[PDB]
């Protein structure tokens, strides 16, 4: 009401009180993977000039 | 309906029976009572448009 004095009756309050909220990122399962490994795990390595 | 009533200056017309009528009126008096938010209504759960 933006007043001290209050006079007799019933009033709507607008919203006062803070609550805090966290942060929930979901995202889709991890699939279809780089084969990185089989250029880590590979015998032999490619050549110099090709 | 087109009338014409048969009007003279020494004649006039008696009703000798009658009937009850009871007729219906309809009156609206009150609505719906509604009431608004700001915050919940314009930005709804955030922090900075609040
Ligand atoms: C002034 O107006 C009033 C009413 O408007 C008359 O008073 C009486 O009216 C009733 C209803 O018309 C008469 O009763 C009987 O009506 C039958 C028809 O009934 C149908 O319609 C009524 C609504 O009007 C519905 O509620 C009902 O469900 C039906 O759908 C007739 O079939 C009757 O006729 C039988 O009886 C007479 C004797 O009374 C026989 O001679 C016939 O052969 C038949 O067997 C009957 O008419 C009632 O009779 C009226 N009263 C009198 C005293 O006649 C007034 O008559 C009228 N005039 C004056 C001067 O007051
Ligand atoms: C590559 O080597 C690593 C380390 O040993 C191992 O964890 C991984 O499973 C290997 N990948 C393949 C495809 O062999």
Redesign the pocket.
């Given at each position: 009401l933006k007043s001290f004095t209050v006079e007799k009756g019933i009033y709507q309050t607008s919203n006062f009180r803070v609550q805090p909220t966290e942060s929930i990122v979901r995202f889709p399962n991890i699939t279809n993977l780089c084969?990185f490994?089989?250029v880590?795990?590979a015998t032999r390595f490619a050549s110099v000039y090709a | 309906a087109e009338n014409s009533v048969a009007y003279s200056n020494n004649s006039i017309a008696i009703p000798t029976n009658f009937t009850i009528s009871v007729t219906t009126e309809i009156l609206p008096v009150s609505m719906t009572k509604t009431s608004v938010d700001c915050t919940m209504y314009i930005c709804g759960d955030s922090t900075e448009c609040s």
């Open positions: 084969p490994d089989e880590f795990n | -």
